[PDB]
Amino acid sequence: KAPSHVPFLLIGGGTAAFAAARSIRARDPGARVLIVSEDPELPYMRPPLSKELWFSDDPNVTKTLRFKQWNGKERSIYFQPPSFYVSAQDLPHIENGGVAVLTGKKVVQLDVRDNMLKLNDGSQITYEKCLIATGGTPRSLSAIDRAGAEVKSRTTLFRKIGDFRSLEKISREVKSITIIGGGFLGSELACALGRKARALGTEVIQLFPEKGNMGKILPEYLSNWTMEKVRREGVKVMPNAIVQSVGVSSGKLLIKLKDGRKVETDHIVAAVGLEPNVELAKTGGLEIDSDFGGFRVNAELQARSNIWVAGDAACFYDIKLGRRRVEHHDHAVVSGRLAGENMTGAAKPYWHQSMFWSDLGPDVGYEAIGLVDSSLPTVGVFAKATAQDNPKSATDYGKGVIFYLRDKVVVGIVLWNIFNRMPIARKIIKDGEQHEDLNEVAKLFNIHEDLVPR
Numbered sequence: 001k002a003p004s005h006v007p008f009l010l011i012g013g014g015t016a017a018f019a020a021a022r023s024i025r026a027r028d029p030g031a032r033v034l035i036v037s038e039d040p041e042l043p044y045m046r047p048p049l050s051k052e053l054w055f056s057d058d059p060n061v062t063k064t065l066r067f068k069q070w071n072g073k074e075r076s077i078y079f080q081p082p083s084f085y086v087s088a089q090d091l092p093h094i095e096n097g098g099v100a101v102l103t104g105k106k107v108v109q110l111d112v113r114d115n116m117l118k119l120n121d122g123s124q125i126t127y128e129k130c131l132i133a134t135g136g137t138p139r140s141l142s143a144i145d146r147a148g149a150e151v152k153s154r155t156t157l158f159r160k161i162g163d164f165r166s167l168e169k170i171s172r173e174v175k176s177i178t179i180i181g182g183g184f185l186g187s188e189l190a191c192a193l194g195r196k197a198r199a200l201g202t203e204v205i206q207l208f209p210e211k212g213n214m215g216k217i218l219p220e221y222l223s224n225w226t227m228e229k230v231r232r233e234g235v236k237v238m239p240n241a242i243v244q245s246v247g248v249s250s251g252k253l254l255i256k257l258k259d260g261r262k263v264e265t266d267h268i269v270a271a272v273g274l275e276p277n278v279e280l281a282k283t284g285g286l287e288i289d290s291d292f293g294g295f296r297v298n299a300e301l302q303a304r305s306n307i308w309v310a311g312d313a314a315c316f317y318d319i320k321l322g323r324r325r326v327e328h329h330d331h332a333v334v335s336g337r338l339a340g341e342n343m344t345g346a347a348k349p350y351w352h353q354s355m356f357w358s359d360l361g362p363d364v365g366y367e368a369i370g371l372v373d374s375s376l377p378t379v380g381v382f383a384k385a386t387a388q389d390n391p392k393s394a395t396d397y398g399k400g401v402i403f404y405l406r407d408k409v410v411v412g413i414v415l416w417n418i419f420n421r422m423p424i425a426r427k428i429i430k431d432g433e434q435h436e437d438l439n440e441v442a443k444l445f446n447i448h449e450d451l452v453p454r
């Protein structure tokens with residue numbers, strides 16, 4: 001199946017690998033590129049798994065994995081149809097090369113010194129240029145680690161097609177599902193499950209340690225506004241909640257909180273962050289970043305002379321913003337594409353800043369860029385939403401911008417229901433100016449109000 005030598009070898013079959021393959025092929029039109037993917041599926045995008053796939057009213061959505069965007073346009077979760085790819089076997093013999101995906105195969109050893117790697121079935125493959133695009137694995141909760149296998153079996157860690165399938169089936173079978181975690185993924189799943197639950201009259205609970213949803217990223221006002229919005233989707237939200245233990249009590253899961261509260265439920269979804277997939281650093285003799293996690297790479301995403309790293313697993317040097325590790329779709333696309341350019345001699349640093357988005361249904365959306373963290377100083381500027389200011393229409397307060405500052409300069413921006421303005425946010429961050437008045441900068445985002453106390 002696997003050829004013995006491949007020029008370009010990409011480890012992991014996700015978003016960063018797909019983008020690098022595309023980039024390599026655009027820059028070297030006869031290039032021969034092999035993606036080694038431990039999953040059985042060809043490369044696909046994750047965002048719809050917590051969003052549009054749940055809003056489909058086609059009962060075969062779980063089989064088709066096609067969805068409608070908020071504006072009604074239908075598409076596949078897969079980046080390309082299967083016919084786009086060439087077989088791994090044909091890859092050395094096909095005139096003008098191509099991209100092949102070896103599915104169901106895991107790279108288990110990296111022998112950097114010999115430009116060679118080993119698969120789980122013992123096959124060995126040599127390369128000229130290699131990209132590590134291994135992503136991450138969801139973290140669990142130590143309280144759940146400590147509980148039995150019975151609790152573990154009724155806890156979902158949500159990241160793939162198989163998890164969407166299993167959880168979707170669970171939502172049709174049980175009466176109560178509890179999401180643990182207040183981040184964007186937990187909050188997206190809450191709204192998705194809350195929507196499903198209204199048709200059946202069942203319950204969705206969300207609990208997290210912070211005062212409100214996305215508390216680690218959004219300042220207080222907007223975090224609180226968001227918690228109230230999730231509640232309006234028919235979710236019972238429980239802020240200020242730290243899990244002490246989880247057990248089974250009379251068939252039910254019983255979550256005990258540190259404050260003495262107890263929550264009975266049928267199933268748990270644990271959305272408490274990602275562990276970057278760095279097992280290959282050991283055999284590879286590659287450095288892991290002890291501050292941010294992931295493989296430590298430079299401004300050009302390079303680890304060693306013929307090894308790059310992109311996507312969720314790459315801790316990189318941002319010449320403007322400092323060392324970072326980002327776990328976002330567009331970042332996987334941007335960093336995968338850049339690695340591909342650098343693998344074909346571009347020698348370019350990360351410059352173009354990647355973006356983030358989240359939707360809580362067709363009516364509420366966030367976009368963000370740069371360094372966004374609720375511990376940084378912030379300035380928020382808000383206004384009443386017009387008709388156009390929701391994810392669907394783009395494709396008392398209801399919208400606004402939040403500037404995140406360091407050394408008096410904007411280093412991150414969150415846009416709340418403001419669409420088609422990311423280029424402006426990216427420019428503000430790039431220019432690094434000390435703004436005399438951020439209410440005047442907010443006018444760049446079509447927010448036009450008198451100054452308000454804060």
Ligand SMILES: Cc1cc2nc3c(=O)[nH]c(=O)nc-3n(C[C@H](O)[C@H](O)[C@H](O)COP(=O)(O)OP(=O)(O)OC[C@H]3O[C@@H](n4cnc5c(N)ncnc54)[C@H](O)[C@@H]3O)c2cc1C
Pocket residue numbers: 011012013014015016017036037038039045046047048049050105106107108133134135136158159160185277280310311312313327328329330332355356357358359
């Ligand atoms: C449900 C969900 C919803 C999301 N929604 C949003 C959103 O709305 N907006 C946003 O900005 N971001 C979102 N994200 C984040 C985004 O999807 C990720 O940042 C992106 O998938 C990262 O791409 P990646 O290629 O780095 O890793 P992945 O897409 O994780 O791909 C890595 C692949 O490599 C495989 N692999 C790992 N190790 C090996 C090995 N040793 N050998 C072979 N294969 C291996 C993994 O199994 C996996 O298949 C979401 C993520 C999830 C899970």
